Amino acid sequence: STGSATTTPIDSLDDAYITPVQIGTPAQTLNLDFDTGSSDLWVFSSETTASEVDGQTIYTPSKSTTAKLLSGATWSISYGDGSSSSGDVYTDTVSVGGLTVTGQAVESAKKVSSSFTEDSTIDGLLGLAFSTLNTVSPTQQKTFFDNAKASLDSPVFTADLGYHAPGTYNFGFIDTTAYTGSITYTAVSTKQGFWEWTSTGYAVGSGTFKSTSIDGIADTGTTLLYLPATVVSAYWAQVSGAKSSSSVGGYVFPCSATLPSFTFGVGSARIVIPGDYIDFGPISTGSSSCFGGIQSSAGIGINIFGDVALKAAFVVFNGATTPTLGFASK
């Protein structure tokens, strides 16, 4: 089997991407944030505290003929941005892009933090990191990908995120029309439950490539590119007037600037992030200070190749017995 679904930016900045997901019988379609940095499939639901729902579409298990309470199971998750959610668990039929899993754990939110309530465009998350991170207790649950794997034509999924445009998540096949050149594969460590890999270095603009190992994670659920302070300083030093602002919470730059590209290494291959991908616009409405898309990972404890980086590539998440990541230009 295979599946193929379109993923759409939630706003003009590509702050996140939503993908429609069918849950239950008859189908209830929710728009979920596919997150390769977590391992829970959770939804706004009929159980969510009413004051914490503001425009989201909810899953109502009592309207699904295939929903079953997973008795005694609870979940609770905290993300890198300080957001959180928790609740109970149902099993139900879940389909993505024509690919169906029966018996998928669908984590029903009873509580969500303010950042979720305030984002009316995201109806929940679909985790695509390794199932070792799943938070369901007392019986840990599998991700949609792990449950689909054995049925797929190839044990892979691919992320093809758009810049200010829709893109695609494919499951079970590699669309050889969706990228240019060849795919470079690189080793993954699953020790922390992430798609963790080591970049071979970077360049700023037209500058020389610096060969240096940068361990980090491929995380579709993180907007920006978070790298070591040395790398980030080297980037922003090439933008007149850029500075790190403790008041704003990272590097800002004059909105009049033209940003340089950023290149990262994948083995001997190179992925170029155009400068315009690194512009996240005014820090507040009407400001002439703009927020940067490359930020320091210091104090986060891991480097994160988030959407800024991943949307410059066609990315293969190879879930074979020995997992690997692949990157191609596009």
Side-chain angles (χ1 to χ4, degrees), residues 1-62 64-67 69-109 112-141 143-148 150-190 192-242 244-330:
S1 62
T2 62
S4 181
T6 299
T7 194
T8 302
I10 65 164
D11 63 23
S12 66
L13 295 182
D14 298 347
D15 282 316
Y17 299 79
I18 50 172
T19 309
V21 178
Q22 284 69 51
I23 311 179
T25 308
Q28 299 181 38
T29 298
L30 275 65
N31 296 329
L32 305 187
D33 185 350
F34 283 22
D35 181 12
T36 64
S38 69
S39 307
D40 288 48
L41 192 177
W42 73 259
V43 296
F44 279 78
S45 75
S46 59
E47 301 182 328
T48 309
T49 300
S51 64
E52 294 180 353
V53 181
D54 187 8
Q56 297 80 9
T57 295
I58 63 167
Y59 169 60
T60 302
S62 64
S64 174
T65 60
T66 43
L69 181 73
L70 185 65
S71 183
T74 62
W75 64 278
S76 182
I77 194 162
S78 301
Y79 296 103
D81 64 353
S83 67
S84 61
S85 55
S86 64
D88 62 9
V89 187
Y90 293 81
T91 57
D92 210 340
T93 302
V94 172
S95 299
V96 176
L99 170 67
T100 299
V101 167
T102 58
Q104 175 62 47
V106 177
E107 302 172 34
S108 166
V112 302
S113 66
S114 62
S115 54
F116 289 117
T117 299
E118 290 165 2
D119 186 359
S120 63
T121 70
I122 292 176
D123 303 323
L125 266 64
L126 188 150
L128 291 169
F130 292 89
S131 294
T132 57
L133 297 178
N134 177 267
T135 76
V136 177
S137 175
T139 307
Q140 189 170 62
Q141 300 293 306
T143 71
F144 175 82
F145 179 56
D146 216 332
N147 283 323
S151 307
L152 293 177
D153 289 358
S154 182
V156 303
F157 68 91
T158 65
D160 182 9
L161 300 180
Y163 169 67
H164 297 343
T168 306
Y169 283 101
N170 292 328
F171 292 83
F173 70 108
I174 289 167
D175 181 355
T176 60
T177 75
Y179 61 87
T180 60
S182 60
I183 306 178
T184 302
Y185 288 86
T186 198
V188 163
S189 173
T190 65
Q192 299 190 85
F194 299 123
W195 292 94
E196 188 170 3
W197 66 287
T198 305
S199 172
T200 53
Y202 70 96
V204 175
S206 60
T208 61
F209 185 83
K210 176 72 166 180
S211 290
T212 185
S213 292
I214 304 172
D215 291 350
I217 65 168
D219 183 3
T220 61
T222 292
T223 314
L224 304 186
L225 174 53
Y226 294 88
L227 290 175
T230 48
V231 176
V232 173
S233 183
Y235 177 79
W236 288 109
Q238 298 305 313
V239 180
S240 299
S244 183
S245 170
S246 61
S247 54
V248 174
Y251 281 89
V252 295
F253 69 92
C255 297
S256 59
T258 307
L259 299 178
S261 65
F262 185 89
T263 300
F264 62 94
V266 182
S268 60
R270 305 290 178 253
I271 301 290
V272 180
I273 305 172
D276 291 350
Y277 290 27
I278 299 163
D279 177 12
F280 279 77
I283 61 170
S284 297
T285 307
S287 180
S288 72
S289 291
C290 275
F291 196 68
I294 295 177
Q295 296 294 346
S296 179
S297 64
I300 305 173
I302 201 155
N303 299 307
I304 307 172
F305 293 86
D307 298 335
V308 163
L310 301 181
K311 73 192 182 183
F314 178 87
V315 188
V316 180
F317 295 78
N318 171 25
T321 302
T322 298
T324 66
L325 284 164
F327 292 82
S329 294
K330 66 185 187 192

